[PDB]
């Protein structure tokens with residue numbers, strides 16, 4: 001899979017994270033990210049995708065060792081952690097044909113797993129609009145505990 005890069009943007013209180021909502025297959029909420037171009041450095045891809053999806057430029061804020069990286073179905077996704085962005089920042093996508101909306105979410109209210117369907121004795125997981133964000137939530141909470149406490 002082609003690797004993806006993007007960001008976890010947090011506000012000044014460290015309570016809230018910025019998610020984006022796409023269209024079609026990408027209808028759920030997720031962290032801003034996208035696929036790396038040929039010869040593009042990870043930091044440059046993260047900044048480009050985030051600026052395309054949110055209109056906010058992270059380039060001056062990225063720290064090289066501060067990221068969460070997950071390999072899901074043999075595709076690597078790396079999100080740089082960007083704290084301290086004011087909640088009153090005006091975010092606006094460049095790609096308004098791919099982004100429906102952009103919102104802050106309380107980290108403590110976000111799920112870190114989807115719910116099963118054990119009440120219905122049925123296998124699998126119930127739909128959840130945060131499906132794509134979910135795998136990052138526990139690692140993020142653990143990362144914020146180690147870094148800040």
Ligand SMILES: Cc1c(C(=O)NCc2ccc(F)cc2)cnn1[C@H]1CCS(=O)(=O)C1
Nearest residue numbers: 020021022025026027028029030033098132
């Ligand atoms: C890959 C994905 C996203 C996602 O990328 N996050 C938000 C986002 C939206 C636009 C954008 F330009 C960049 C990020 C969201 N949903 N999905 C689908 C995977 C298969 S599914 O389970 O049907 C849901």
